[PDB]
């Protein structure tokens, strides 16, 4: 009946609503794998057509994350500057965590455009180092067998973090962070899943992967810019110069 147990239900709701695909849909489609003809078709496409495809899927992913943040109790109550600071540093980190749901650790494939395919699908992009890192991060995260409420609460904490440089009302972020930590700890105790806390990825790993990802995305956006209808215009202008 506590203010925290509600916070749990509310975070789980925002997440359920901003969830692009349902987990059992992703799990059942684990059989639906791209054929060598389909893989070759992706590999033979231009760098620029594979880029427009991936950039549009990644922008859509960020927009679901912005909506997940918007629906978190207290997020709107922060000043616009703090909202930008938190989403600029964390939105893509959330997108990267969420990918573990579309990842199949057995055949090392990811759900991309209706079917499951390996990293070979992305050859055309010519950044096999970054793509291998993304797949390796999803592969490590998959061993935790994250549940839907775990991903929800963990991703809310990835976003609500008072240790992001440039925050104005720092104590207002701390107040939201500490409530979400309590919700996360409380929830893990209730379900006997406190063991995942020791297995969680180090804060630096995520931060590092994401900065590399976003810089590679920024280079591609400079060379071949895609156009997106901004869900959060002040955030969009902070990433798209
Ligand atoms: O709809 C919006 O308001 C919105 C929509 C998307 C963002 C956003 N894009 N982004 C990218 O990395 C990105 C993507 Cl996903 C595709 C193509 C180019 C880019 C790049 F130019 F920024 F590099 C981000 C990283 C971190 C945080 C927010 C965002 C921001 C706002």
Numbering used by the authors: 267 to 507
Copy text verbatim from the article accompanying this structure deposition:
To elucidate the molecular basis of RORγt modulation by MRL-871, we performed co-crystallization studies with an equimolar complex of RORγt-LBD and MRL-871. Co-crystals grew in two different space groups. Crystals in space group P6122 had unit cell dimensions of a=b=108.5, c=104.7 Å, diffracted to 2.2 Å resolution and also contain one molecule per asymmetric unit. The overall structures from both sets were identical in all the features and the ligand conformation. MRL-871 binds instead to a previously unidentified allosteric pocket in the RORγt LBD, located distal to the classical binding site (orange). Crystal structure analysis shows that this allosteric pocket, absent in the classical NR-folding motif, is formed by helices 4, 5, 11 and the reoriented flexible H12. Hydrogen-bonding interactions exist between the molecule's carboxylic acid group and the side chain of RORγt residue Q329 as well as the main-chain amide hydrogen atoms of residues A497 and F498. The unique conformation induced by the binding of MRL-871 prevents interaction with cofactor peptides, which typically bind RORγt through a conserved LXXLL motif, at the AF-2. MRL-871, however, effectively antagonizes the RORγt coactivator peptide recruitment interaction, independent of cholesterol concentration. In contrast, the inverse agonist T0901317 competes for the same binding site as cholesterol, resulting in a competitive displacement and a cholesterol concentration-dependent increase of the IC50 value for T0901317; that is, RORγt binding and inhibition by T0901317 becomes less potent in the presence of agonistic ligands. Together, these data demonstrate that the allosteric inhibition of coactivator binding to RORγt by MRL-871 is both potent and independent of orthosteric site occupancy.
